Symmetry: C2
Subunit: 373 residues, 2 copies
């Protein structure tokens, strides 16, 4: 077919990601290619509320009813298990920059790389033995189980705290006092960007955590963190990023990115690049490269959401083998996937922000673990 149409699912607080989505379609459509574009790319997108699972399913069905060849979307802890299961039976590849699933789910392509390995290698590098682990239920229990798996082999004094339920900010002040009784100077934060910032604000008010302390923020949106007031007290801060600003392709992309009009592209000017928005663009790069390979193979690409009728099997299976076949050098390093859709062959840029200085500490890849230069 001349025009491949893909499904879009965008929840709340993904405003910039939507702008990153619309632009990623335009730069491919504007060709210009005898070879880079053999087909045109369209999309129909439905904004939704995640908590209500009914709203999640009907959006998916309305997209499938249209006959889309791929679906790009988002999920929380609640909507995760539903969307992965619907794609597993209807055989439709689900592209997402949301947190990687603990289970070996099929027809799910996970753009966000796993931090699971990057943390443990650095905790072995820093040789931490007595530290605190603060976490929410949002990112998943993979990392909550991951450290308990290996920490007992190295005997580490780790203390866990669930904060996803805590709404009161006074509760955030009393949780830290408990660790000072256990003489804790080292902290590992595993929350979403928006949450991480709120307890760092509590560090300012209680005060004197400035010096001798160490905060490791297990989140890829390190730029979107308010680090300012913590820096000037004497704290050692280790953070994680996938995006490298030295990359000429990213700088090539940014020169165009700041130009976009607000009425057509929200949060493009006012807000800085969120890591999820960068993955949104790189998600298109995978879809584009997979479908270019599809007419390279010259394959005629193959409804209703009903269990009883019996879903077709000749459909769907063919796209997965070619989507997870890709090796595209994009903004987020090297984009490759395993059999389950998880990322592999990715470089994680490690940043050390210390009172004395602020610099890139090193890089992380699965083979060489952590390299500190």
């Amino acid at each position: 077919p001349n025009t491949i149409s893909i499904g879009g699912l965008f929840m709340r607080n993904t405003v910039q990601e939507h702008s990153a989505f619309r632009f990623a379609v335009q730069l491919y459509n504007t060709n210009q290619n005898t070879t880079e574009k053999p087909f045109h790319l369209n999309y129909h997108v439905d904004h939704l509320d995640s908590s209500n699972s009914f709203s999640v399913t009907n959006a998916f069905c309305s997209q499938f009813s249209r006959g889309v060849y791929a679906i790009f979307g988002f999920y929380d802890q609640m909507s995760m298990n539903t969307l992965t299961s619907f794609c597993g039976a209807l055989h439709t590849s689900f592209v997402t920059p949301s947190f990687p699933t603990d289970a070996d789910v099929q027809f799910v392509i996970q753009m966000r790389p796993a931090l699971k390995g990057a943390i443990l290698s650095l905790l072995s590098y820093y040789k931490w033995e007595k530290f605190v682990y603060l976490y929410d239920t949002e990112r998943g229990f993979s990392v909550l189980q991951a450290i308990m798996e290996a920490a007992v082999q190295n005997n580490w004094q780790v203390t866990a705290r669930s904060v996803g339920n805590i709404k009161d900010v006074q509760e955030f002040r009393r949780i830290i006092e408990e660790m000072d009784r256990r003489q804790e100077k080292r902290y590992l934060i595993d929350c979403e960007v928006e949450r991480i910032n709120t307890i760092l604000e509590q560090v300012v008010i209680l005060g004197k955590h400035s010096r001798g302390y160490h905060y490791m923020l297990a989140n890829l949106g390190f730029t979107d963190i308010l680090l300012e007031r913590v820096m000037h007290g004497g704290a050692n801060i280790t953070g994680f990023q996938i995006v490298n600003n030295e990359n000429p392709m990213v700088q090539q992309f940014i020169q165009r990115w700041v130009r976009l009009d607000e009425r057509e592209f929200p949060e493009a000017k006012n807000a800085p690049l969120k890591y999820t928005s960068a993955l949104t663009h790189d998600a298109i790069l995978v879809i584009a490269e997979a479908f270019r390979y599809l007419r390279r193979q010259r394959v005629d690409v193959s409804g209703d959401c009903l269990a009883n009728p019996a879903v077709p099997w000749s459909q769907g299976i063919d796209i997965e083998r070619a989507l997870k076949m890709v090796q595209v050098q994009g903004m987020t390093g090297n984009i490759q996937f395993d059999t389950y859709g998880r990322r592999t062959n990715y470089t994680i840029d490690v940043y050390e922000m210390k009172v004395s200085g602020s610099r890139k500490a090193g890089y992380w890849n699965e083979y060489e673990r952590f390299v500190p230069f």
Copy 2:
């Protein structure tokens, strides 16, 4: 109308409930006095959230008045949204919901309540907490929010992912370095029993099983060890209405009703009989007022049904779980929980618990 049909949904490992759901209708269909009852059964997959929607929309197209069934944690999120939006009342002996939702009548009473008073009767302050990723975070949060109010140091363990039966022993051998002997288990029977299977650690230990299916738990294996075990039951053997069911339930056709003589009457299979008793009186209350009762499974056009949810949540009937009344959300009220103590000393009935009366030991 002279006949009302209620939708039926069943998961895996629910055979005892299947026949108990069947037999309760056969009792009702023999009268003896107002309207005929019908039911449709769908056998679904728990983990897969695809078959749940399929079996639900198949039940709804038939447009059954009230849907009965069970939910796994991966499927509970499916029915809670669907029953609320398509306005169809749900009846369940499965775990109570954590969040405040509408259009479901939860037969299973509150497990959370009894624990908060019974731990103070024993003066417990340091214990181990083994929880599941099945019944929800409601019980774990009830511990966590109360641990700061009464100053208790506890170790809550995520044993839900433990599939291989070797990790258990590695957790217990760490517990004796922290030299604590008290235990609080909040898991399902198929995983509760395996803990007691993987029990040196018998003399001077107290286990607390936070599950209403006390009978089906294999504990006599650990009882000779002399370990103390506290259990909870809503099924009352002293109740004359319970034995009346059992006398016909046991001496029942095995071909039509499997697991009738194969296994003891579980609380899930007990709550299923009471689930018909809630439906029967709610629809007879609708008969008192004559309330007239009246497709696709898509939300575009949208889509009545507030009719029955209103009457199901008000009922006051005596079943096999004794008192059955409902809160706005569908949770039990004015109910009574029996607590059992198993001791090397003796085996006995410690007392009862209700929301108003706290704990009573006679």
